[PDB]
Every structure is written in C-alpha cells, then in structure tokens.
UniProtKB/Swiss-Prot annotation, chain A:
PANTHER family assigned: 39S RIBOSOMAL PROTEIN L20 (PTHR10986)
Alphabetically ordered keywords of this record: Ribonucleoprotein, Ribosomal protein, RNA-binding, rRNA-binding
Annotated protein name in UniProt: Large ribosomal subunit protein bL20
GO CC field: ribonucleoprotein complex; ribosome
Similarity field: Belongs to the bacterial ribosomal protein bL20 family.
UniProt cross-references to Pfam families, sorted A to Z: Ribosomal_L20 (PF00453)
GO biological process, one term: ribosomal large subunit assembly
Keyword Cytoplasm listed: no
Organism: Thermus thermophilus (strain ATCC BAA-163 / DSM 7039 / HB27)
Phylogenetic placement of the source organism: Bacteria, Thermotogati, Deinococcota, Deinococci, Thermales
Role of this protein: Binds directly to 23S ribosomal RNA and is necessary for the in vitro assembly process of the 50S ribosomal subunit. It is not involved in the protein synthesizing functions of that subunit.
GO terms, molecular function: rRNA binding; structural constituent of ribosome
InterPro entries to which the protein is assigned, alphabetical: Ribosomal_bL20, RIBOSOMAL_L20_CS, Ribosomal_protein_bL20_C
UniProtKB/Swiss-Prot annotation, chain D:
Family, as annotated: Belongs to the universal ribosomal protein uL4 family.
Example of a GO biological process term: translation
Cellular-component GO terms for this entry: ribonucleoprotein complex; ribosome
Assembly behavior: Part of the 50S ribosomal subunit.
Organism domain of life: Bacteria
UniProt keywords, alphabetically: Ribonucleoprotein, Ribosomal protein, RNA-binding, rRNA-binding
Organism (species): Thermus thermophilus (strain ATCC BAA-163 / DSM 7039 / HB27)
Part of the intact protein present: 53 to 202 of 205
GO molecular function: rRNA binding; structural constituent of ribosome
Designated name of the protein: Large ribosomal subunit protein uL4
Function, as annotated: One of the primary rRNA binding proteins, this protein initially binds near the 5'-end of the 23S rRNA. It is important during the early stages of 50S assembly. It makes multiple contacts with different domains of the 23S rRNA in the assembled 50S subunit and ribosome. Forms part of the polypeptide exit tunnel.
Gene label: rplD
Curated annotation (Swiss-Prot), chain E:
UniProt name for this protein: Large ribosomal subunit protein uL13
Organism: Thermus thermophilus (strain ATCC BAA-163 / DSM 7039 / HB27)
Domain of life: Bacteria
An annotated Gene Ontology molecular function: structural constituent of ribosome
Family as reported in the entry's similarity comment: Belongs to the universal ribosomal protein uL13 family.
Matches recorded under Pfam families: Ribosomal_L13 (PF00572)
GO biological process: negative regulation of translation; translation
Swiss-Prot record, chain F:
PROSITE patterns, A to Z: RIBOSOMAL_L22 (PS00464)
Organism: Thermus thermophilus (strain ATCC BAA-163 / DSM 7039 / HB27)
Gene3D superfamilies in the record: Ribosomal protein L22/L17
CDD domains noted in UniProt: Ribosomal_L22
GO MF entries: rRNA binding; structural constituent of ribosome
Protein role: This protein binds specifically to 23S rRNA; its binding is stimulated by other ribosomal proteins, e.g. L4, L17, and L20. It is important during the early stages of 50S assembly. It makes multiple contacts with different domains of the 23S rRNA in the assembled 50S subunit and ribosome. The globular domain of the protein is located near the polypeptide exit tunnel on the outside of the subunit, while an extended beta-hairpin is found that lines the wall of the exit tunnel in the center of the 70S ribosome.
GO CC annotation terms, alphabetical: cytosolic large ribosomal subunit
Subunit structure: Part of the 50S ribosomal subunit.
Protein name per its UniProtKB record: Large ribosomal subunit protein uL22
Assigned protein family: Belongs to the universal ribosomal protein uL22 family.
GO biological process: translation
Listed HAMAP family: Ribosomal_uL22_B
Record keywords, A-Z: Ribonucleoprotein, Ribosomal protein, RNA-binding, rRNA-binding
RNA sequence: GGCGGUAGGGGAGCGUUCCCGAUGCCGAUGAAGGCCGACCCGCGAGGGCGGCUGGAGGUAAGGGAAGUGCGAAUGCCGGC
RNA sequence: UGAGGGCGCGAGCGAUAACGUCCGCGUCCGAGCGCGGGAACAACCGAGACCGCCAGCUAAGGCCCCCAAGUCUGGGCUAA
RNA sequence: ACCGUGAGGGAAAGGUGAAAAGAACCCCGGGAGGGGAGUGAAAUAGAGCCUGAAACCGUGGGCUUACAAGCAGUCACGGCCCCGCAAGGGGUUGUGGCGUGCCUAUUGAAGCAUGAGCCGGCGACUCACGGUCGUGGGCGAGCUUAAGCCGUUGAGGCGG
C-alpha cells in the first residue's frame, strides 16, 4: 500500500499564494517566500489591531485639546472638571462634537470651569 | 569559478530598467526623386539609379 | 437630535434613523429593546450625572450571525511556534426606532 | 542493483556529500522502511470463536432470520430446482442469504446465485454469517454445530 | 466612526518677531503648521496654515548665542563640516535663522517639506501684500 | 477581423526579435515593410516571411484587402531550445542555450 | 477560577494509498485531476457550492492496514 | 536536562581594572527577540499577551515641536 | 547509448485517436512554419499528438511611480478602476502610525555563525522475536497452544 504525495503538497502552496496576493515580486509567487511574509503579517496585524485604538486614542485627544484651547483652557484642565462632574460618558471619540454641532460641546466646557475655580 | 561576483540574483525590474536604453531607433528614410520608392538619405535606390551615376538593374 | 447611547462596553453617536452593529444580548432576534442608558440631546441636554435622568432610546433588532472571519495566526519567530486560528465576532443587526421618554 | 561506490569525493567537491546510490535520499536507489513481505495471522483463542460462533447464530434467531431445513425439492443438481424451493419456502430475492448443507448438489443449484453464497457445514465463518442478511442451515450441520457446542 | 473632512480651506497668518524670543516663538509656529489648533486636525492630508513672518534680523535669543551658537553644514568632502555661527547668518542670511529651526520641529516624513513650504520668513518688513494678513499675536 | 500567422520554431533567441517586433507594432503595413526592409538586424528577415505571410492570409483566406490593413498586435514567445556544450577550460563543460522563437503577428482593418 | 511558552508529557482531530462494506451505489444529463471565487460549514489541519477545462473512473456512514502530510539536509532527478 | 547567561548583593582571584573568571542568595533572558519608558539596546523600569471591539482606570516613565499630556501654581538656585 | 585501456560503472525515454479516416487541394514562403478547406464526436486530440500545475518568458488591459531613504509588510483614511440592491464588495496605493527576513546550533541575535537561486516530484521511527506498563475483550484454579493432520479454495476443525 503505497501512498505517494500527489494532491496534498500542491494545494497548500496555492493557499499561501492565495494570501500572498499583491506581494512584491517573488514574495507572492515563490512559495517558501510567501510562507515568510505571511508570518510577519499575522504578527504585524496582531500588534496593530491592539494598536489601532492607541492611534485613535491619541488622535481624539489632540482634537479635544484643539477644542479646549479654543475656549481658552488646556486639555488637562478640561478633563478634570468633567471628571469632577463625574461623567463617565465622554468616550474620547464622542468628544468629536467640534464639527458635530459645537454648542453641544462648547457648553460642555463651561460645565468644567465650575468645579475647580 | 572566479573573481568579483554578483551577490544576489538581480531582480526583474532591476534587469529590465537597465534595458530601456536598448529599444531600436526605427530607420529614417526619404522617397526617391523619380521612383515612388522609399530610400535612405544620400543614397541610390535598389531599383532606379540616378541622373549622374547609374545603378540601373534588369528584369 | 443627538442620540448618544452606551451598550456592550462601547457608546455611540446615533441620529435616529438607520441601522447599527452592536454586540449580542440575551434576547430573541425578533423584538425591540430599550436603552434607558442615554446621553445628551441635539437641542443641548448635558448630563451632570453620568447616565441621564430616566430618558431612553428604543431600538429594533433583526438577526444575528457574523461579519468577517478574521484570521488570527500567532507565530513566534525562531521557536517553531506557529498557530493558525480565526473566529467570528457576532453582533446585532440593530435598528433604532425612537428616543421616546 | 546499483553498486557500492562513492559518487564523488566529499573533500574539495563544491556539491554536498554522498555515497552509494542505493541511498534513499537520492532517487531510484533504495526504499526507506518499505513493506517487506510478512504474515498477518495469529492465534485467536478458540473460546472466542466458539462463543463467537454461537453469538451470531442466535443473532439471526433473536431476529428470526433463521431456518433449519431437511426437505428439498432440490436434492439434485439444478439452479431451477431450488429457486422454486425458495419460492415455496420464503426467499423472494429481497435480502441476502447464507446457505449451509452437506449436499454438494444444492450448492450447484445456487452456486451461481448472486444473493446466496455457498458454505460447507464446517467453516461457519462469522464473516459470511454477519455478511449475509439471513441464514439457512441443515441438520447435517446441526450435528457438528452441536458437536462444537450443543 | 471618526470624523474626517473632505475639502479644506486654509488660512494665512501674519506674525512679527521683534523682541520675540527665538525658539519659543518658532515653536508655536510648527504647531501652527501641523494644524493641531484645528479640531478638524488631520494626520496626513496636510491642512497646515501659511505663516508669513515679517522681519527677523531683529530677532534676539537668550544668552550670548549670537556669539556662541554655530550651525553645521556638511558638503561631503573632507574639511566640509562648515560651522557657521548665529551672527554671520544674522547679517547676510537672517532668513534661515528660523527655517533651520522649524524644520527641527516639523515631523520627519515627506509631509514635512510640504508643511515647511506653507511658510515664508522675510526680514524687512512689509512683505508682498498678497491679500489677507491675519496678524495673530 | 484580425488575421494571424505564427512561424513556429525559429532558431533565433527571443530577446533579439522582441527588439524588432517592438517597432512595427501600431505602424501601418506600408511603413512596417519599409521599416523592416531597411532594419539592419537579423530578425527583420524572419518577420518578412511571417508578416507578408500574415498579411497574405489576410487576403488569400480571410477576405480582406491589403490596401488598408494595419499592424493590429504582434508578439513572440519562447519555444524550447537545443542544448550544446561549451568546452570552457580545465575540463569544465558549460552547456549553451541556442534559443528558438515563436513570432506571432496579427493585423486588422483601418476603417470601413 | 485558569488558558505566553522551547526541550518533553497526555488528549483530540483533518488529509493521502489500499481492504470489508460491493454481483452496492454515483458517473456520458461528464468521474478522478487541473484553473478560478468576494459563497457556506470548521477556531483548525480540512469538508461542501457556482463557473471553466478534462474525458472514465470514483466510492458514503461504521471497522481495518499503511511506503502516509515537507521549507531547507552546500538533500537527489528534471526544468527554468 | 545535566555547556547556560544577565543584574542587584557577600566574598576569592585580578591591579579595591577588565561588557574578565570561580562561588552563595534572589531575580529575570533562555522558554517572554510578544507590549510600553530607557532615541536605538535579550534579561534596567513596568507589566504574564486565549481571541475581538475606533470603550474606560493605570505602573514605569513623561506633559514646548517630531511626541499623546500644564510653556500649571507657589518658593529658592545657576550665567556656564 | 555514454564514461573507462581495463575490469567495471550505467542512465533518460510510455500514452493522438476506437478507427490514420493523418490533412487532397489552394495561398505566403527557399524550405521549415503557418492561414483556409476538408476527415474526425472533438484538431481548443496535429504526429514527443491523454491530462496540463509551478518555476521562467512575452502581448493586451485597470491602479501607480521621475522630492525620495526602503525584510518590501500591517493598520487608518482618502483617491482610481471595476462588481454589486440599500448598504456593501474586489483590485491598486498617496499620505500618516508601527515594523531588525526563515530554519539550525547557539546563553546570545537583525547580523560579520550553518544552510538554501526558484519551482515541481523521491526522501526520513515501520517490521520480526522476546519483555515491562497501560488498556479492550475470552475463560476463570485454571488459561493456552506450536509444528503438523481432514476440506471449499480468501471456510474452519482437530492437534495438550
Ligand atoms: Mg485613553
Ligand atoms: Mg469639539
Ligand atoms: Mg441606551
Ligand atoms: Mg475572527
Ligand atoms: Mg534494481
Ligand atoms: Mg571523499
Ligand atoms: Mg485513486
Ligand atoms: Mg523603547
Ligand atoms: Mg488574563
Ligand atoms: Mg502636545
Ligand atoms: Mg537515475
Ligand atoms: Mg444604512
Ligand atoms: Mg518543493
């Protein structure tokens, strides 16, 4: 009962090609090259799916910081009042109401200058 | 087996970008004073002759 | 009219009249659920307390399932540790009705 | 059949290191751990087949799929001199049947029967018993099957 | 999802630098380029504003840097490390006394030498009256 | 309708004729000929016995007129190759690839 | 409540070749194999589905036997 | 598995040198070259990664710009 | 065949079609090779003629590139072309975030430590006997056969 290779070894190399689509030169047609750059991706995609928030976590703040300093106060001084107001609402994204109607946020600012000064 | 040596198999673009300077200039030509033929500058066409220097062929 | 809402560990900015994906909840896929957890108002209604005072937003479900299976292959270099794994992330094809209270 | 001679020295060669061409790493040379011929038999205790002989017989009795016989319109040699016997007994080609008898005539009368396999009174192979969906046997059997156990 | 605009109209700015401390001035300028003074800040599309800083030969800096700080330029040849002081430039090229400071605060990618384009620092003053001249102080 | 003709199996390396074919491409046949008949190469001859033979069967088999057609598309691929050895030095034997070709020329219709 | 993980240990599975299952069944209204796909099942190795090509074998559910799963060995053959 | 290595410490050797070595305790890399600060930097600092989410609290470390966060308040200090 | 004086070493290479019915004839052309017509169920079965992958070469088309610093990818957004029904999806990438290839040995890597040009196939814990543990089944003061002998020929029974 002999069982040569046959189908098995090829179909797999076709799947790696299937995920190596648009990879420069040999990196998408040479098999044991495509095997490699897939290793980094699934790692590169892992870490960055952990990172994509911290990216936006940072971006939101600057926009927020851009807003508060347009009333005349810093981001550090902005947040505290909100926290002093105990408002677990402000998903740092949802503070994007600087081009999503501003008085909705412009009057979040004055509810900060209260409980501190 | 000798001296300097390529290190890495030269890639495709690599190989190909060198080869832009290799495409052929198509031949420039004029038409014969008499013949309705196409012919180089400063030449004598392989059918006609001239008017101060023969070439006249045969049937 | 600004309709904020906070469900499944994340909040969102809703204007009333289109669909949304949110995580599941112990519900039958053909009904309508209430989120008395609400924030704000498009005519300016700040909330000194976190959660509003009793207001709400009404949303209609649709079904369940998954969007994309996203492969999660973990490979540690050097040390023969490759893993091949993926999953589906279910959700609720959620349709929001009103902001009534 | 290849010889036993190094292919090219390993020292100062450029290529790898190698030897005789029976080496499985090559091609066409030798097999690795190929399947040389060998027996598969053993010695299963008789008390497993003895009891194993009984178990299967009742299995057809437990389902009724049994019949001892003694009377035959086909005590001679003709496949036609049997299928009518089956007609007058109850075998309408619906389901398979194993047959036992000590008469080498009835076997002929069904040795060409696709749904009826011959069987001598002795080698009641539990394979063919469980193979066929119904069983038939005779007293000429039910004295040795009895002398086995009974 | 997140807010991103589509079209963006920029705005220009007028700034002087008489008595303005050198570095602290040019610091806000970079922020004023990288429009993080714009809640519609965009981390790639280059929304940077256009700062037109008239006058600079009258720029002063803390300490004795006028006779102490030197800038470096490297040709490639030996003996190429050209060490130019903050004084000799404040005499025939007082225009790049700020430039080779903001580029020191602009980011590193290709967007930098786009942001730095959206800014010119003459020393006159009274620059080419293009149009609007938003003098922010 | 396009008309085609391949000169299978032509002992000339591809890298050579591709330089030539890539000159009559898009040119009208009249110029294509005058281009070829004065193109100091070697592939120019092989095209001629496959061009005017591809413009031929655009007439003797595909009822078109030569007075109109144009170089629609023209390409060449790579056939096999005879293998010959090259006694290099000190006993080395480095083979050599004498390459053939597969010159392919198709022609269309100007107007009408 | 725990679930990073090398040598190593245990458990679970997918695939290939062949046999019982078969004088069975699927197959000319197109099998095995090869090109695709953004469809579906599975976390998986994999299994189904639509299209193209090919042209004659292929074999379920439960058991059994293996020459059984490749990315490297300056591995071997061939081609490039 | 029985070649280990780093750092803090207590010794010996060494020149109260060695990113040198031999020991003891402990820690960590090896097996955590997976994350954050240390510009970079296996073992220095924080912190054990089952997967997903454009959610919130934090440690180290940081808050003028690249670079997210006070050119924060009060009090002194230094002109290199 | 080929190598070696010599003993001796010692390969590669099967596949049209059921039937040659294998292209008469015409045309380009020196021929080779092709176009057409025709046989054939099929010439996309054309005489290295079943299937035809992969490396490798080229033509056509969609996206991009001549202010840019790069294990060549990942994440985000926009942009171009295409599919599609809301919405969504495919292919490309301009900008921004991060990003020190694989295996093996090494305490130790990104490495100036081994190895691989690439692709496709062959290729690496099986077997026999005895024995320890585990487990599944048979009998249970018992348990069990070996050579061999009767018989269909992929049947077993005796044999202590
Ligand atoms: Mg945060
Ligand atoms: Mg705002
Ligand atoms: Mg709610
Ligand atoms: Mg998933
Ligand atoms: Mg042999
Ligand atoms: Mg040797
Ligand atoms: Mg088979
Ligand atoms: Mg760091
Ligand atoms: Mg945990
Ligand atoms: Mg900042
Ligand atoms: Mg051989
Ligand atoms: Mg919608
Ligand atoms: Mg291979």
């Amino acid at each position: 009962p002999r069982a040569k290779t046959g189908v098995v070894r090829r179909r797999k190399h076709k799947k790696i090609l299937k995920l190596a689509k648009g990879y420069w030169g040999l990196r998408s047609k040479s098999f044991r090259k495509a095997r490699e750059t897939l290793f980094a991706a699934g790692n590169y995609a892992y870490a960055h799916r952990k990172r994509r928030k911290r990216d936006f976590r940072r971006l939101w703040i600057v926009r927020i910081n851009a807003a508060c300093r347009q009333h005349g106060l810093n981001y550090s001084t902005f947040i505290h009042g909100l926290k002093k107001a105990g408002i677990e609402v402000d998903r740092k994204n949802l503070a994007d109401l600087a081009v999503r109607e501003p008085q909705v946020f412009a009057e979040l600012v004055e509810r900060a200058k209260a409980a501190q000064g | 087996a000798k001296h300097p040596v390529p290190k890495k198999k030269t890639s495709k673009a690599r190989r190909d970008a060198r080869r832009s300077h290799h495409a052929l200039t198509p031949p420039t030509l004029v038409p014969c004073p008499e013949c309705k033929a196409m012919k180089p500058p400063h030449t004598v066409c392989p059918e006609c002759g001239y008017y101060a220097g023969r070439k006249v062929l045969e049937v | 009219m600004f309709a904020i809402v906070k469900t499944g560990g994340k909040q969102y900015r809703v204007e009333p009249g289109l669909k949304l994906r949110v995580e599941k909840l112990d519900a039958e896929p053909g009904a309508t659920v209430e989120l008395p957890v609400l924030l704000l108002g498009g005519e300016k209604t700040v909330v000194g307390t976190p959660v509003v005072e009793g207001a709400s937003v009404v949303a209609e479900v649709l079904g369940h399932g998954r969007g994309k299976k996203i492969l999660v292959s973990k490979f540690k270099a050097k040390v023969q540790y490759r893993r091949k794994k993926g999953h589906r992330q279910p959700y609720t094809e959620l349709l929001i009705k009103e902001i009534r209270g | 059949a290849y010889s036993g001679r190094k292919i090219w020295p390993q020292k100062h060669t450029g290529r790898a290191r190698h030897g005789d061409i029976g080496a499985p790493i090559f091609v066409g040379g030798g097999v690795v751990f190929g399947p040389k011929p060998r027996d598969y038999s053993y010695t299963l205790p008789k008390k497993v087949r003895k009891k194993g002989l009984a178990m299967a017989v009742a299995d057809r009795a437990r389902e009724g799929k049994l019949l001892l016989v003694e009377a035959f319109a086909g005590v001679n040699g003709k496949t036609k001199e049997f299928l009518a016997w089956a007609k007058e007994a109850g075998l309408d080609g619906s389901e398979s049947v194993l047959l036992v008898t000590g008469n080498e005539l009835v076997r002929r009368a069904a040795r060409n029967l696709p749904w009826v396999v011959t069987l001598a009174p002795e080698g009641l192979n539990v394979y063919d018993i469980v193979r066929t969906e119904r069983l038939v046997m005779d007293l000429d059997a039910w004295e040795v099957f009895q002398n086995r156990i009974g | 999802k997140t807010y991103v605009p589509k079209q963006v109209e920029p705005r220009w700015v007028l700034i002087d630098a008489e008595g303005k401390t050198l570095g602290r001035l040019a610091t806000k300028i970079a922020t004023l380029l990288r429009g993080k003074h714009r809640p519609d800040w965009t981390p790639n599309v280059a929304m940077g504003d256009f700062v037109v800083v008239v006058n600079a030969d009258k720029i002063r800096v803390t300490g004795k840097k006028l006779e102490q700080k030197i800038y470096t330029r490297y040709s490639g040849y030996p003996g190429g490390l050209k060490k130019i002081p903050l004084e000799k430039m404040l005499a025939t090229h007082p225009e790049r006394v700020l430039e080779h400071a903001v580029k020191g605060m602009l980011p590193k990618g290709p967007l930098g030498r786009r942001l730095f384009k959206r800014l010119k620092v003459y020393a006159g003053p009274d620059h080419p009256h293009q149009a609007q001249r938003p003098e922010k102080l | 309708m396009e008309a085609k003709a391949i000169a299978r199996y032509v002992r000339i390396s591809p890298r050579k004729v591709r330089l030539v074919v890539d000159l009559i491409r898009g040119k009208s046949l009249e110029e294509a000929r005058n281009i070829l008949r004065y193109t100091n190469k070697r592939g120019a001859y092989f095209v001629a016995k496959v061009l005017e033979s591809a413009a031929a069967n655009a007439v003797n088999n595909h009822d078109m007129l030569e007075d109109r057609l144009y170089v629609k598309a023209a390409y060449v691929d790579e056939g096999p190759a005879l293998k010959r050895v090259l006694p290099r030095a000190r006993g080395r034997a480095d083979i050599i690839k004498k390459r053939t070709s597969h010159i392919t020329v198709i022609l269309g219709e100007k107007h009408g």
